Amino acid sequence: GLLKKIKWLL
Numbered sequence: 678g679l680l681k682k683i684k685w686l687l
């Protein structure tokens with residue numbers, strides 16, 4: 678999921 682990748686960046 679895309680949000681999980683954002684979460685990973687942040």
Ligand SMILES: CCCCCCCCCCCCOP(=O)([O-])OCC[N+](C)(C)C
Binds near residue numbers: 678679682
């Ligand atoms: C107006 C604001 C726009 C902000 C845009 C920010 C960039 C977003 C980049 C998102 C990249 C991640 O995509 P993803 O889930 O791996 O893609 C789906 C890939 N498959 C179909 C193979 C599963």
Ligand SMILES: CCCCCCCCCCCCOP(=O)([O-])OCC[N+](C)(C)C
Binds near residue numbers: 680
């Ligand atoms: C309504 C539009 C808002 C736009 C502004 C951006 C807000 C981003 C907030 C993102 C907060 C992180 O959420 P999360 O803990 O992973 O999600 C919990 C729910 N699920 C488990 C189903 C994913």
Ligand SMILES: CCCCCCCCCCCCOP(=O)([O-])OCC[N+](C)(C)C
Binds near residue numbers: 683
């Ligand atoms: C779905 C797209 C998401 C894009 C990413 C958005 C990230 C937004 C992060 C917002 C975090 C808010 O932190 P807060 O509690 O107010 O602390 C901040 C406190 N100071 C100002 C003193 C440093």
Ligand SMILES: CCCCCCCCCCCCOP(=O)([O-])OCC[N+](C)(C)C
Binds near residue numbers: 680
């Ligand atoms: C901002 C933070 C939100 C946190 C909650 C995330 C919940 C994720 C739910 C995921 C399912 C939502 O699929 P939808 O939009 O109906 O798909 C429509 C797709 N097409 C346009 C290709 C048909």
Ligand SMILES: CCCCCCCCCCCCOP(=O)([O-])OCC[N+](C)(C)C
Binds near residue numbers: 683
């Ligand atoms: C308006 C400008 C928009 C620019 C958007 C450019 C696309 C960005 C896609 C970012 C995808 C990041 O997540 P991921 O590939 O799962 O991370 C894997 C881990 N590393 C990042 C350390 C390699």
Ligand SMILES: CCCCCCCCCCCCOP(=O)([O-])OCC[N+](C)(C)C
Binds near residue numbers: 683684
């Ligand atoms: C995924 C990494 C990015 C995280 C982005 C965090 C955005 C914070 C927005 C704070 C301002 C809006 O306050 P609220 O309506 O009570 O916010 C509820 C937000 N959460 C569901 C995440 C608790």
Ligand SMILES: CCCCCCCCCCCCOP(=O)([O-])OCC[N+](C)(C)C
Binds near residue numbers: 679682683686687
């Ligand atoms: C796939 C989603 C793409 C959209 C992401 C939206 C979030 C805002 C852009 C963040 C992209 C850069 O993050 P990064 O330099 O790796 O982390 C921040 C730097 N530290 C790790 C040192 C804290």
Ligand SMILES: CCCCCCCCCCCCOP(=O)([O-])OCC[N+](C)(C)C
């Ligand atoms: C609307 C604007 C949306 C912008 C979304 C941008 C998402 C892509 C961020 C790419 C920023 C460049 O990362 P880099 O130095 O090559 O990776 C450093 C990664 N670590 C910190 C984990 C080591």
Ligand SMILES: CCCCCCCCCCCCOP(=O)([O-])OCC[N+](C)(C)C
Binds near residue numbers: 686687
């Ligand atoms: C649609 C246009 C939106 C423009 C605004 C985007 C705001 C993005 C705010 C990005 C806030 C950066 O937080 P950060 O230091 O990486 O936090 C996480 C720190 N740790 C990794 C140590 C937990």
Ligand SMILES: CCCCCCCCCCCCOP(=O)([O-])OCC[N+](C)(C)C
Binds near residue numbers: 684687
């Ligand atoms: C970009 C900032 C990432 C901060 C990461 C460090 C966590 C501690 C600071 C929490 C600040 C308030 O966060 P909130 O409104 O309850 O959202 C929570 C959304 N995440 C669960 C995805 C973080």
Ligand SMILES: CCCCCCCCCCCCOP(=O)([O-])OCC[N+](C)(C)C
């Ligand atoms: C090619 C695409 C380019 C996308 C560019 C995305 C930019 C994302 C910005 C991420 C900012 C993360 O802040 P940081 O490293 O933890 O600094 C925080 C340091 N102070 C507390 C002293 C201010």
Ligand SMILES: CCCCCCCCCCCCOP(=O)([O-])OCC[N+](C)(C)C
């Ligand atoms: C007119 C309305 C104006 C509202 C303006 C709101 C500005 C909020 C600024 C929020 C800056 C985000 O936090 P930061 O410094 O990147 O820390 C990221 C890491 N922590 C969440 C743990 C602190």
